[PDB]
Short mmCIF file of C-alpha atoms and ligand atoms in Angstrom, two decimals:
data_model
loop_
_atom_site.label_atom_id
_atom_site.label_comp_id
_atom_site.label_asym_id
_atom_site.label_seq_id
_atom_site.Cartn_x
_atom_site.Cartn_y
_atom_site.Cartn_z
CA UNK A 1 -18.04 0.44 -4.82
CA UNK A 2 -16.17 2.93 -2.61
CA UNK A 3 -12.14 3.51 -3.87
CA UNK A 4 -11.01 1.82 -0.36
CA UNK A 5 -13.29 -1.27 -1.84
CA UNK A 6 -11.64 -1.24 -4.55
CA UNK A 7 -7.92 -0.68 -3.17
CA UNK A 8 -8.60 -3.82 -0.96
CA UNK A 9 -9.28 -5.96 -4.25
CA UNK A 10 -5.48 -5.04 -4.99
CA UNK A 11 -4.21 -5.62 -2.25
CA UNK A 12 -5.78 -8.81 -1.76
CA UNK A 13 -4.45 -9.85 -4.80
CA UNK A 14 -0.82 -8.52 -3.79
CA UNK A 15 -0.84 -10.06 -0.02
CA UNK A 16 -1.23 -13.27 -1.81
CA UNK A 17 0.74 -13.37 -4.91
CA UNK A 18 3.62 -13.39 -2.65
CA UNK A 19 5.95 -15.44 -2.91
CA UNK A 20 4.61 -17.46 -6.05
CA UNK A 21 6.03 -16.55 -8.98
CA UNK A 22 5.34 -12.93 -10.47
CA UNK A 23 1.99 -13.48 -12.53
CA UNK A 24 0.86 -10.67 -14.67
CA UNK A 25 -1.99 -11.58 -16.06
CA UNK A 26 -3.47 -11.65 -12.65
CA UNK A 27 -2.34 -8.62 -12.30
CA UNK A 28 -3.72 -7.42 -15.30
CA UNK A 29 -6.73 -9.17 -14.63
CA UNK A 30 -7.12 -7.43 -11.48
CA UNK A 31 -6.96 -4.01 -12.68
CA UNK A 32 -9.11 -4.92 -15.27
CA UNK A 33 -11.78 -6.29 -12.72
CA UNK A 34 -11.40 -3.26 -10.59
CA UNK A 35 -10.89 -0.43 -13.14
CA UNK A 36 -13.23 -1.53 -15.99
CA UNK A 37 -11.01 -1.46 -18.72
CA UNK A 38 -8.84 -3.50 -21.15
CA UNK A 39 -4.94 -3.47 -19.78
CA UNK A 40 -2.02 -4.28 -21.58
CA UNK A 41 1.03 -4.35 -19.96
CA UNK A 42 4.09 -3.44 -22.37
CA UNK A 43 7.75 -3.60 -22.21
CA UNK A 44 9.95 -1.00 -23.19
CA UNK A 45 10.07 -3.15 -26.47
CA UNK A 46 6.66 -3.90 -26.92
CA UNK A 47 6.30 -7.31 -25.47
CA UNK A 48 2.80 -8.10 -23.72
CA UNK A 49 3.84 -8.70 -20.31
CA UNK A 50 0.35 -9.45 -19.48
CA UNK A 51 -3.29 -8.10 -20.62
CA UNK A 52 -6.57 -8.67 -19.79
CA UNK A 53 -9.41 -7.81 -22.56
CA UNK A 54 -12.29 -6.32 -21.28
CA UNK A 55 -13.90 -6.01 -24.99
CA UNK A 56 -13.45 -8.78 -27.28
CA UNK A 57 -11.35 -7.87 -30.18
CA UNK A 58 -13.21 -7.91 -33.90
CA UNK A 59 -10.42 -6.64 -35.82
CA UNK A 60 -7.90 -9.32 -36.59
CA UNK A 61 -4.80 -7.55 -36.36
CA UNK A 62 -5.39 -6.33 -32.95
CA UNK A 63 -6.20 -10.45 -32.36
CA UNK A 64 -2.62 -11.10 -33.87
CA UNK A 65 -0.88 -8.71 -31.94
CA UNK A 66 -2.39 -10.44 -28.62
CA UNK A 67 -1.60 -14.31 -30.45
CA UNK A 68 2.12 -12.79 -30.62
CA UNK A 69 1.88 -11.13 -27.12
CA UNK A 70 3.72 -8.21 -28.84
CA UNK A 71 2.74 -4.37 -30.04
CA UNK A 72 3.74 -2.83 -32.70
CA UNK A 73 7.46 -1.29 -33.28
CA UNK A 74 7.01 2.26 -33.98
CA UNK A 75 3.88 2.51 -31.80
CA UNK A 76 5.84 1.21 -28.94
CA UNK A 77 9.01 3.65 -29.47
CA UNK A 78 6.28 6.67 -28.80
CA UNK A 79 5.29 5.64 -25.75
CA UNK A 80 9.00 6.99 -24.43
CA UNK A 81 7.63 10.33 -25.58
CA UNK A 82 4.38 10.34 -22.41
CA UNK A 83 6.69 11.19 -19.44
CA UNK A 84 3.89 11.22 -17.04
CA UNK A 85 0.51 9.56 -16.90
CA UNK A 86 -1.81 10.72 -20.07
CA UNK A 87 -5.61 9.73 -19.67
CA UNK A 88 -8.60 10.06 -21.68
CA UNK A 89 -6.71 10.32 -25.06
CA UNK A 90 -9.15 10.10 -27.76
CA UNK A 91 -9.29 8.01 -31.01
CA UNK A 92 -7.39 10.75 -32.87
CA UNK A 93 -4.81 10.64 -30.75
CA UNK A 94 -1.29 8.74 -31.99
CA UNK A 95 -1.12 7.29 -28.71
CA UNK A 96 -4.58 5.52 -29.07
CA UNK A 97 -4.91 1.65 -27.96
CA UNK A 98 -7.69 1.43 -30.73
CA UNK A 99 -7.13 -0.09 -34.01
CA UNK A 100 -7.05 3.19 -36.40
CA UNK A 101 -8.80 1.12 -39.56
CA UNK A 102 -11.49 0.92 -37.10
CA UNK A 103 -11.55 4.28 -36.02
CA UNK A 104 -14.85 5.15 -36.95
CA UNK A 105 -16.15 2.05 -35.00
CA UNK A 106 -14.23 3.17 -31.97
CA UNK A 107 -15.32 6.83 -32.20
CA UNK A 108 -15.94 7.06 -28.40
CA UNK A 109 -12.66 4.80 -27.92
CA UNK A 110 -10.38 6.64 -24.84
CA UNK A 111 -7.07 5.27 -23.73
CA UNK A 112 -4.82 6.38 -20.93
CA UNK A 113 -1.24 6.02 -20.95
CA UNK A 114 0.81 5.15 -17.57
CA UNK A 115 4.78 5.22 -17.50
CA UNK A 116 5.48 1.95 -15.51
CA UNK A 117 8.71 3.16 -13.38
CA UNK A 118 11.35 1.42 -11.55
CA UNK A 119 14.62 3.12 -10.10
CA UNK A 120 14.63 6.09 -12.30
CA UNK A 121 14.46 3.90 -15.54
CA UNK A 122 11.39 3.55 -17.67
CA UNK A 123 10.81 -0.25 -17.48
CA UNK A 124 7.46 -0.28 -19.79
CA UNK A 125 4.08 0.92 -19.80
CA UNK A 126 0.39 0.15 -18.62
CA UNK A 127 -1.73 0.74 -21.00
CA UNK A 128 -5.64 1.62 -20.11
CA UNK A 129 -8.75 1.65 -22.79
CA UNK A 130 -12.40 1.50 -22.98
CA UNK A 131 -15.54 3.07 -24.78
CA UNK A 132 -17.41 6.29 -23.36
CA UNK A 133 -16.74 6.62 -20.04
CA UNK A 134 -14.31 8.74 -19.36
CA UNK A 135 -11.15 8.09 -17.03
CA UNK A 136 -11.72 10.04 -13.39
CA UNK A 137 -9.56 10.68 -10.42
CA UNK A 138 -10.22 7.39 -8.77
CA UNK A 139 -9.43 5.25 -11.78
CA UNK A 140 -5.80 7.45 -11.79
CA UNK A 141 -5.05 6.23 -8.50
CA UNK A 142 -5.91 2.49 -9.20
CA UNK A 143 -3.75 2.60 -12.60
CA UNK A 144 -0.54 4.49 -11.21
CA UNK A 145 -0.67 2.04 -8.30
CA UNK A 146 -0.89 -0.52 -10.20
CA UNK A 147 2.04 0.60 -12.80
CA UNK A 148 3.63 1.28 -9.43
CA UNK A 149 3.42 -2.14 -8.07
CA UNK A 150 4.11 -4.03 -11.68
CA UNK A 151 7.20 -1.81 -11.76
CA UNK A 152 8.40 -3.44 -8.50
CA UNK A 153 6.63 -6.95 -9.79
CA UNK A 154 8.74 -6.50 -13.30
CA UNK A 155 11.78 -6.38 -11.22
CA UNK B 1 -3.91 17.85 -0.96
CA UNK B 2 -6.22 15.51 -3.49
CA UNK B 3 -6.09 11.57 -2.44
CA UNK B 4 -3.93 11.32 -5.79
CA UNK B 5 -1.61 13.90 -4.72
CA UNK B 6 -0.41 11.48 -1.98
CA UNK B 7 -0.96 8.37 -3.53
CA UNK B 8 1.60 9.41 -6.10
CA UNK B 9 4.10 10.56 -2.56
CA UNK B 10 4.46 7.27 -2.02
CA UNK B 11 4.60 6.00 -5.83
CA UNK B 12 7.67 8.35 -6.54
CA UNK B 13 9.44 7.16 -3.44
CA UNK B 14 8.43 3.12 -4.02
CA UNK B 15 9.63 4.12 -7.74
CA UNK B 16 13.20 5.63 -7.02
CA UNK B 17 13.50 2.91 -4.05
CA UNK B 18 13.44 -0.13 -6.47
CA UNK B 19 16.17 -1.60 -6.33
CA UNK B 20 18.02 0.61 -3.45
CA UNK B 21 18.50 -1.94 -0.32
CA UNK B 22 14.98 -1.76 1.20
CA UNK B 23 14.85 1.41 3.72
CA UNK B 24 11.82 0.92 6.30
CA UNK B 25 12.41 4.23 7.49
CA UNK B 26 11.69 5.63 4.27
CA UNK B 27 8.92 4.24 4.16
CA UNK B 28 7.70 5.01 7.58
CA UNK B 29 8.58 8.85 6.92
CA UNK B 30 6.69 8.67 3.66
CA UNK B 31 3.65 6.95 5.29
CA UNK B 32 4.10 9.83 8.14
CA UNK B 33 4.18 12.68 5.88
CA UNK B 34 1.10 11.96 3.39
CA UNK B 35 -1.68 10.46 6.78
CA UNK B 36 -0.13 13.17 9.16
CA UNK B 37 0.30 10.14 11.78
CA UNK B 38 2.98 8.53 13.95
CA UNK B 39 4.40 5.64 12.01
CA UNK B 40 5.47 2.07 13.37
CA UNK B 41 6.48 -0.56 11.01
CA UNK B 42 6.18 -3.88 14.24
CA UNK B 43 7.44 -7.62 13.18
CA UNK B 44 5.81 -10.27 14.51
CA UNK B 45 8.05 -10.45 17.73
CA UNK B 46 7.75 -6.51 18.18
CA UNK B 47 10.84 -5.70 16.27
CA UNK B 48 10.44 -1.94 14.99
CA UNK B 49 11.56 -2.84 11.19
CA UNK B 50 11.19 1.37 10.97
CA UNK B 51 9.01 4.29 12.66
CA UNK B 52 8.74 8.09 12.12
CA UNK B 53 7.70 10.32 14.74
CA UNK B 54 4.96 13.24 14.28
CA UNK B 55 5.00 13.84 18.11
CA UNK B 56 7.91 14.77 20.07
CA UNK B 57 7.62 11.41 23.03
CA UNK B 58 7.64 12.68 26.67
CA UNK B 59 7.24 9.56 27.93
CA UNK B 60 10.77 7.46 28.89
CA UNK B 61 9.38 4.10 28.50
CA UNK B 62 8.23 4.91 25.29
CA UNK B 63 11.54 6.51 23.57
CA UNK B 64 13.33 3.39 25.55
CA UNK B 65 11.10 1.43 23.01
CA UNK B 66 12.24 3.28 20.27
CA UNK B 67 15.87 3.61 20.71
CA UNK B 68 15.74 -0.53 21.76
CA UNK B 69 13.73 -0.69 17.87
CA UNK B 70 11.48 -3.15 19.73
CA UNK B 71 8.02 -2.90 21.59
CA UNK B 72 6.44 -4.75 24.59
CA UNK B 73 6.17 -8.51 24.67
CA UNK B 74 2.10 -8.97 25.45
CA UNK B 75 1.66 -6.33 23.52
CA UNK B 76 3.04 -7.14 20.36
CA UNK B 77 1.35 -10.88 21.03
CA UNK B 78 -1.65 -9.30 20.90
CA UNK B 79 -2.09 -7.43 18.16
CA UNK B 80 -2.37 -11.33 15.93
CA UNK B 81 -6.10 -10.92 17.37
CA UNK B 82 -6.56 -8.28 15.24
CA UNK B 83 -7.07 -9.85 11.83
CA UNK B 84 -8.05 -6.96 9.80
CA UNK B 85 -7.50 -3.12 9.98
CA UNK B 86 -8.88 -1.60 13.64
CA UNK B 87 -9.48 2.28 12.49
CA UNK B 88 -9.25 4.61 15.56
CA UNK B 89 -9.40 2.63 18.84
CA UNK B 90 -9.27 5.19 21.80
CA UNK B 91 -6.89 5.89 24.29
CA UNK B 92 -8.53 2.83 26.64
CA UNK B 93 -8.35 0.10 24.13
CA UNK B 94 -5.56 -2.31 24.87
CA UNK B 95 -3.78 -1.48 21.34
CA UNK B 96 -3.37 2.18 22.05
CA UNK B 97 0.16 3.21 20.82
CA UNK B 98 0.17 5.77 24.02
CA UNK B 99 1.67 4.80 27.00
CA UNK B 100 -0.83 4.01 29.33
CA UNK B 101 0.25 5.96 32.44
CA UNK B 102 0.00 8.84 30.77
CA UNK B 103 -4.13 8.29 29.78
CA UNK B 104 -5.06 11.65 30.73
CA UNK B 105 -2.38 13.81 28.67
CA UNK B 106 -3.21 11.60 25.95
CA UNK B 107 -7.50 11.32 25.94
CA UNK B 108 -7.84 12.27 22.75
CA UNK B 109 -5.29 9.88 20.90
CA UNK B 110 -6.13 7.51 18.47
CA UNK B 111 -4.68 4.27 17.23
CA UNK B 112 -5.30 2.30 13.86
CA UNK B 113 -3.92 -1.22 13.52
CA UNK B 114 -3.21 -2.39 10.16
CA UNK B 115 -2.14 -6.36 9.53
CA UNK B 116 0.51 -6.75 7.29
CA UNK B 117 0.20 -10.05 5.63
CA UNK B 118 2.58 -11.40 2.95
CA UNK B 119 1.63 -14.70 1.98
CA UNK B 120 -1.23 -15.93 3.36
CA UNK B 121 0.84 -15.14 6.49
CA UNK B 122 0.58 -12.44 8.80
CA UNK B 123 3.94 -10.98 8.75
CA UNK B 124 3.85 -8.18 11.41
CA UNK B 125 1.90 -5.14 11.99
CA UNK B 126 1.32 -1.29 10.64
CA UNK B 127 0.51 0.99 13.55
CA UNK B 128 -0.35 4.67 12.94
CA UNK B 129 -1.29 6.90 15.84
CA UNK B 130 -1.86 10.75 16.62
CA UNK B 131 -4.22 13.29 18.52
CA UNK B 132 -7.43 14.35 17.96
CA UNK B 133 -8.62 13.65 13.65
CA UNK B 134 -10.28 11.00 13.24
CA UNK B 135 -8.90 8.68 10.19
CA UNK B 136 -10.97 8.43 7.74
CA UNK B 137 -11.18 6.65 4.31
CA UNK B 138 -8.33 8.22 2.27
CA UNK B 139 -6.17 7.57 5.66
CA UNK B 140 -6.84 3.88 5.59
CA UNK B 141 -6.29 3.83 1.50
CA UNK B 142 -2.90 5.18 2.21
CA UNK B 143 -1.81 2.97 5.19
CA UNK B 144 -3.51 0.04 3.89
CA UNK B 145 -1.38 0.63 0.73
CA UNK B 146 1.46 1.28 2.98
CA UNK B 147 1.27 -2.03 4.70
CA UNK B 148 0.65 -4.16 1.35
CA UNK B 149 3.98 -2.80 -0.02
CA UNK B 150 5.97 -2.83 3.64
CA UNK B 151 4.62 -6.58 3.19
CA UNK B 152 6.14 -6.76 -0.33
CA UNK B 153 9.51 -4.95 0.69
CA UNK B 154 9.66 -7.16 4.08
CA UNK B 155 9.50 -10.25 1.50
C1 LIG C 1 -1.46 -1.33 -30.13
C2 LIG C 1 -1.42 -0.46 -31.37
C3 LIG C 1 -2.65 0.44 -31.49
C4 LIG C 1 -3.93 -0.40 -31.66
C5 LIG C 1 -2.49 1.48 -32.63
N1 LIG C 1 -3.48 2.58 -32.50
C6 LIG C 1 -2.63 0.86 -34.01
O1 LIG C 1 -3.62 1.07 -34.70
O2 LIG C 1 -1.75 0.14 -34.49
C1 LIG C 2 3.82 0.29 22.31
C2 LIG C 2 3.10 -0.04 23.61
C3 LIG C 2 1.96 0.92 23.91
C4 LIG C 2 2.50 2.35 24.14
C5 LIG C 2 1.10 0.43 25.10
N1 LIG C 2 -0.21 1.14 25.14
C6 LIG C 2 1.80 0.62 26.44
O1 LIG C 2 1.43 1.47 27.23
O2 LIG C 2 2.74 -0.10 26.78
#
């Protein structure tokens, strides 16, 4: 589907999550629906906001971490270090959303990382993998606006 | 500039304007800036919540409007029977943002009519006009965005 299509999904979703409480896992779900990705939405601490699995997860302590709703510690401190959106980051990468016992499984594994920002103050991260295909242009746009809009959602 | 270049315009200004008392204007000028358009942010009763100006107005009725903040009274009734966005309707449609006794200075302008809705509700009304380009696809992305968020930061 065109970009616009997909923009309109969003904003569907946004025109009527107003005013019922802030929910998001549908927002998580959304992007996940319109991006084609798993999404994890993580606060500056590592709590799981919301997600939405694309891939189900055969590795148990990735399984736990969702159970917990909560990424690991030092993990979660990098993420400070990505300033700026960070796509396409391979399995080798420290930043990678792939369980690293299981990189070999998750060879073709890319993640992209997108500050979620919120009056000048880091408020968390959206978090962006999948197998193969990598991240364009288009999918940029959908993730920033959505780490835009959860940014003004999280407040 | 790149879609992505202006999608991320208006994600660095929604960003720093979290949580800044909302400024309509800033929006308006934002939303002016990345489409290249006249900007009118309408409530429901023709209340102009914020515009920005791309065209110097030679027309007395029309800056009356804007100093007043407020547009017509049929007018704004009418633009509830547009339910979804109207993409450049010409100079003789009855939602042209020109002023009508001035047709023939203004042939070639063009008028897109974006609903903001906010809860199931239609909350008021995006309208974006200028001369002679046609809008096109990235133009509604942007103003559609526009108006989802204006419908966020009205709530
Ligand atoms: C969410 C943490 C991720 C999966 C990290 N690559 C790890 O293996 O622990
Ligand atoms: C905002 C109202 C607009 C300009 C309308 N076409 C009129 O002439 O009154």
């Amino acid at each position: 589907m065109a970009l616009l299509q997909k923009t309109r999904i969003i904003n569907s979703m946004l025109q009527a999550a107003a005013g019922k409480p802030v929910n998001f896992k549908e927002m998580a779900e959304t992007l996940r629906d319109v991006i084609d990705s798993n999404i994890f939405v993580v606060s500056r601490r590592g709590k799981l906001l919301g997600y939405s699995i694309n891939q189900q997860i055969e590795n148990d302590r990735m399984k736990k971490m969702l159970e917990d709703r909560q990424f690991p510690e030092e993990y979660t401190k990098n993420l400070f270090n990505v300033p700026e959106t960070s796509s396409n980051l391979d399995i080798n990468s420290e930043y990678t959303a792939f369980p690293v016992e299981n990189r070999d499984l998750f060879q073709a594994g890319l993640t992209t990382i997108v500050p979620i920002i919120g009056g000048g103050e880091r408020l968390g991260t959206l978090i962006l993998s999948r197998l193969q295909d990598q991240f364009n242009d288009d999918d940029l746009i959908l993730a920033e606006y959505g780490a835009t809009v959860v940014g003004m959602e999280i407040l």
